[PDB]
Amino acid sequence: GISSRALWQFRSMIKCAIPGSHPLMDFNNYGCYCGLGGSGTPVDELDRCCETHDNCYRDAKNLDSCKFLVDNPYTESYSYSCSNTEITCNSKNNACEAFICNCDRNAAICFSKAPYNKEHKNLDTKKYC
Amino acid sequence: QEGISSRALWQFRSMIKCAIPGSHPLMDFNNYGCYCGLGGSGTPVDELDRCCETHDNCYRDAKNLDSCKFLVDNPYTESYSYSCSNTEITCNSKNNACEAFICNCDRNAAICFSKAPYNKEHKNLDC
Numbered sequence: 001g002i003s004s005r006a007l008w009q010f011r012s013m014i015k016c017a018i019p020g021s022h023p024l025m026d027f028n029n030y031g032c033y034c035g036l037g038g039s040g041t042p043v044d045e046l047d048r049c050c051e052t053h054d055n056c057y058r059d060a061k062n063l064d065s066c067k068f069l070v071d072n073p074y075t076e077s078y079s080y081s082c083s084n085t086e087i088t089c090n091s092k093n094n095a096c097e098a099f100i101c102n103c104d105r106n107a108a109i110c111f112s113k114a115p116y117n118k119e120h121k122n123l124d125t126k127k128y129c
Numbered sequence: 130q131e132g133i134s135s136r137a138l139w140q141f142r143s144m145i146k147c148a149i150p151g152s153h154p155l156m157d158f159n160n161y162g163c164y165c166g167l168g169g170s171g172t173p174v175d176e177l178d179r180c181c182e183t184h185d186n187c188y189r190d191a192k193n194l195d196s197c198k199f200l201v202d203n204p205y206t207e208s209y210s211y212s213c214s215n216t217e218i219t220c221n222s223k224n225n226a227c228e229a230f231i232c233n234c235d236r237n238a239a240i241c242f243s244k245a246p247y248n249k250e251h252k253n254l255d256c
């Protein structure tokens with residue numbers, strides 16, 4: 001229930017909170033939960049940020065205001081502003097968009113404060129997850 | 130990284146939309162079979178999955194090309210030129226060696242996707 005437009009916005013937030021980051025390269029295949037989907041137990045703080053992010057999205061999907069995501073995930077996108085590494089979700093976002101924007105903001109901030117362990121990058125999910 | 134870069138994935142997405150009207154690339158060609166999505170292994174479950182395996186192999190070949198050495202540290206700096214005309218994809222001749230190779234990978238996959246049957250029963254599997 002996720003779209004490319006949504007992923008692109010999340011990527012934007014990470015770029016906002018973490019100057020010089022390359023989101024796909026850094027977070028698309030890290031630990032057990034950083035990337036699309038996830039399984040098992042998060043291996044460190046950053047991985048927990050991702051798992052928390054995914055659970056927040058699950059919560060979003062359960063919101064009545066997000067029912068449209070069941071058949072049209074690619075039809076929705078929230079607005080946010082980046083100012084000097086600070087993320088602000090737009091007041092014009094509808095209930096569903098606002099919740100998702102907040103999930104992404106919490107994740108980007110979490111990523112920015114969690115240690116990055118190269119050893120957990122490209123983890124053998126078929127053994128550790 | 131797998132997929133090369135977000136912008137590379139976005140370009141591939143645009144090319145798939147060109148070849149398959151009404152398609153939603155991430156929704157359709159992501160998390161399908163054993164090869165459509167992040168990496169992949171095992172026996173492709175169907176033609177579409179084989180299209181994905183081939184695309185994955187192609188990106189691997191790209192990263193191994195001498196002309197694509199810059200992709201090693203700065204994969205997010207790559208981008209190519211192509212045109213879309215009534216679902217027909219044309220990789221621009223101005224593309225350099227590396228860009229040309231990647232455009233070709235994407236073009237072959239987009240075409241392959243457009244002719245491969247889509248089996249919903251192969252979505253979200255496990256290979």
Ligand SMILES: CCCCCCCCCCCCCCCCOC[C@H](COCC(F)(F)F)OP(=O)(O)OC
Nearest residue numbers: 004007011023024034035050053054057138142154
């Ligand atoms: C087949 C064509 C594919 C087209 C895709 C083009 C879009 C490319 C943009 C995506 C790459 C941006 C990289 C951003 C990181 C990926 O983020 C992955 C994941 C997505 O969020 C999952 C959620 F459930 F929360 F919605 O975040 P997380 O689980 O926190 O793990 C980091």
Ligand SMILES: [Ca+2]
Nearest residue numbers: 033035037038
């Ligand atoms: Ca995840």
Ligand SMILES: [Ca+2]
Nearest residue numbers: 164166167168
């Ligand atoms: Ca793959």
